[PDB]
Amino acid sequence: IHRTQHWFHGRISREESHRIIKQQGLVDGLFLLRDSQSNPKAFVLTLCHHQKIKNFQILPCEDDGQTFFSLDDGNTKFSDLIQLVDFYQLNKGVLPCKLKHHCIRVA
Amino acid sequence: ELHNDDTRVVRVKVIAGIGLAILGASDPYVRVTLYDPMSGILTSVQTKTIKKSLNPKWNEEILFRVLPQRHRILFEVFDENDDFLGQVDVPLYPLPTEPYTFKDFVLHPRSHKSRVKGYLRLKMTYLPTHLPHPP
């Protein structure tokens, strides 16, 4: 589970995640994943690029009993958040840039 | 999960469809599906659609982190107008490490009512005190 993943920050707010990204340098490709505050089964990719912070909702869908996740309306689907991060570290897709450095969790 | 040191990154070029099956008004795209036969789909990606073509040139590139000996990639060509235009299902080993050249894979039907023809041109190569818990 992504709960052991260093890029996963769990239940922090939008505001908190922006504060974290800024404090750790506002560098291109700096990112973190967290829980969505608007959907208990969704997550959010928070990503910095050109000194701007974007939030991408990662929505679940069920295909034949198994949950898949997507931030681009099903064009690109993943069995879990680990696959999602591995993919966007290697491909830009709809993102402004590839995922590069994760933010370190803050107490 | 922790990083798996057995993983490699495969560069997948989805180049073109060749001679796909009156007007021939198909709008083809490829659904590219990385999966583990024993546990299921890991990542699925769709190329762009090309309008009104039986010889679409996508020239799209996709990188996957994979377990060469276990994972496989299924390529499915669809008519966005989805109707099935054929599939190619490959292992991820052996592949050369990175020029090397493409292969024109035969497209296969998936059912007796499938009528598919032509090839899918692909190139695939490998690239060379404590943390707080999340609330």
Swiss-Prot record, chain A:
SH2 domain boundaries: 7-88
Modifications the protein undergoes after translation, according to the UniProt entry: Phosphorylated on serine residues upon EGF, FGF and PDGF stimulation.
Places the protein is found: Cytoplasm
Tissue specificity note: Widely expressed.
Loss of function: phenotype: Disruption of the maternal allele results in overgrowth of both the embryo and placenta such that mutant mice are at birth about 30% larger than normal. This effect occurs during embryogenesis and results in addition in disproportionate overgrowth of the liver with relative sparing of the brain. The major part of the growth phenotype seems to be IGF2-independent.
Organism domain of life: Eukaryota
Further facts: The GRB10 locus is imprinted. The maternal allele is expressed in most tissues, except the brain where it is expressed from the paternal allele. Expression from the maternal allele in fetal and adult brain was however described in PubMed:10861285.
Subunit structure: Interacts with ligand-activated tyrosine kinase receptors, including FGFR1, INSR, IGF1R, MET and PDGFRB in a phosphotyrosine-dependent manner through the SH2 domain. Poorly binds to the EGFR. Directly interacts with MAP3K14/NIK and is recruited to the EGFR-ERBB2 complex. Interacts with GIGYF1/PERQ1 and GIGYF2/TNRC15. When unphosphorylated, interacts with AKT1 and when phosphorylated with YWHAE/14-3-3 epsilon. Interacts with NEDD4. Interacts with LRP6, thus interfering with the binding of AXIN1 to LRP6. Binds to activated NRAS.
Family listed: Belongs to the GRB7/10/14 family.
Job description of the protein: Adapter protein which modulates coupling of a number of cell surface receptor kinases with specific signaling pathways. Binds to, and suppress signals from, activated receptors tyrosine kinases, including the insulin (INSR) and insulin-like growth factor (IGF1R) receptors. The inhibitory effect can be achieved by 2 mechanisms: interference with the signaling pathway and increased receptor degradation. Delays and reduces AKT1 phosphorylation in response to insulin stimulation.
Entry note about domains: The PH domain binds relatively non-specifically to several phosphoinositides, including PI(5)P, PI(4,5)P2, PI(3,4)P2 and PI(3,4,5)P3, with modest affinities.
Protein name, per record: Growth factor receptor-bound protein 10
Organism (species): Mus musculus
Gene coding for it: Grb10
Full protein stretch here: 514 to 620 of 621
Swiss-Prot record, chain B:
Gene ablation phenotype (knockout): Lethal during late gestation. Embryos show a retarded development and defects in vasculogenesis and angiogenesis.
Tissue: Brain.
Locations listed in the record: Cytoplasm; Nucleus; Cell membrane
Domain C2: 1-100
Domain notes for this protein: WW domains are involved in recognizing PPxY motifs in substrate proteins. The WW domains mediate interaction with LITAF, RNF11, WBP1, WBP2, PMEPAI, NDFIP1 and PRRG2.
Subunit organization: Interacts with NDFIP1 and NDFIP2; this interaction activates the E3 ubiquitin-protein ligase and may induce its recruitment to exosomes. Interacts with UBE2D2. Binds, in vitro, through the WW2 and WW3 domains, to neural isoforms of ENAH that contain the PPSY motif. Interacts with BEAN1, LITAF, RNF11, WBP1, WBP2, PMEPAI and PRRG2. Interacts with murine leukemia virus Gag polyprotein (via PPXY motif). Interacts (via C2 domain) with GRB10 (via SH2 domain). Interacts with ERBB4.
Note: A cysteine residue is required for ubiquitin-thioester formation.
Function comment: E3 ubiquitin-protein ligase which accepts ubiquitin from an E2 ubiquitin-conjugating enzyme in the form of a thioester and then directly transfers the ubiquitin to targeted substrates. Specifically ubiquitinates 'Lys-63' in target proteins. Monoubiquitinates IGF1R at multiple sites, thus leading to receptor internalization and degradation in lysosomes. Ubiquitinates FGFR1, leading to receptor internalization and degradation in lysosomes. Involved in ubiquitination of ERBB4 intracellular domain E4ICD1.
Name assigned to this protein: E3 ubiquitin-protein ligase NEDD4
Coverage span on the entire protein: 71 to 246 of 887
